[PDB]
């Protein structure tokens, strides 16, 4: 918007994606900050619709949108704590208590989304932002979709996620349940938080690092950097068969999950 840019300074780019970028906008008079996602016409049509459904403390707030020619402008909560990735020291991760707290907040967000029949489909640290009190905020619903209509689930079939975070059934099954896919990527996020590295390029047979995990070689990186209490949870999350994979209600029963640190 031309009138918007007259009163709001587009200060800097917060991030760049495939079909555009997110910018920090600051009102010159009030100094209010908002994030402006600019998309040259990710599924932007469904993104807006899904964003309109969301209302939760661990999801990036959606203020509104408008079209200006062929460009779509989405107005989002500015998360001034930045990205989760920037709390992860490469090859080291972060303190276990910090990882635990973020993971609880991630579960809170995912439980909310799943409760209203929405799957994010691209959970990774780049899409987990932080507010000014370091509260985790799930971000970017460009790949999200509805997997439950009222109380009626449907299987999904789309392989749109970032490969290191994708569940193995996406490489093996034509159709699959939404919830265990998101649970899997949450486990990859937890691994990154605790070890500062991703375990594999992809969870395929042909990927050696995935084979090593399947064969319980937890004396190798990244696993050897992870305490056995949180590793025990990862053992239940990063289960190949999505039908045998831990569900979020059972994650809430895990010893490490509930361990005071
Ligand atoms: C840093 C940041 C703050 C923010 N506040 N509100 C928002 O939508 N964002 C963001 C939205 C997106 C991204 C982004 C984008 C691409 C890659 C990547 O790694 C990060 C960062 C932010």
UniProtKB/Swiss-Prot annotation:
Residues 1-257 are annotated as: Interaction with CLSPN. Expressed ubiquitously with the most abundant expression in thymus, testis, small intestine and colon. Its main location: nucleus. The active site is at residue 122. The keyword Phosphoprotein applies. Changing residue 122 to A: Abolishes kinase activity. It is found in: Nucleus; Chromosome; Cytoplasm; Cytoplasm, Cytoskeleton, Microtubule organizing center, Centrosome. ATP binds at residues 14-22, 37. It comes from the Eukaryota. Keywords: ATP-binding, Cell cycle, Chromosome, Cytoplasm, Cytoskeleton, Disease variant, DNA damage, DNA repair, Isopeptide bond, Kinase, Nucleotide-binding, Nucleus, Phosphoprotein, Serine/threonine-protein kinase, Transferase, Ubl conjugation. Changing residue 37 to R: Abolishes kinase activity. Residues 8-257 form the Protein kinase domain. GO terms for cellular component: centrosome; chromatin; condensed nuclear chromosome; cytoplasm; cytosol; extracellular space; intracellular membrane-bounded organelle; nucleoplasm. The autoinhibitory region (AIR) inhibits the activity of the kinase domain. It is linked to Oocyte/zygote/embryo maturation arrest 21: An autosomal dominant, female infertility disorder characterized by zygote development arrest due to failure of pronuclei fusion. This is Serine/threonine-protein kinase Chk1. It comes from Homo sapiens (Human).
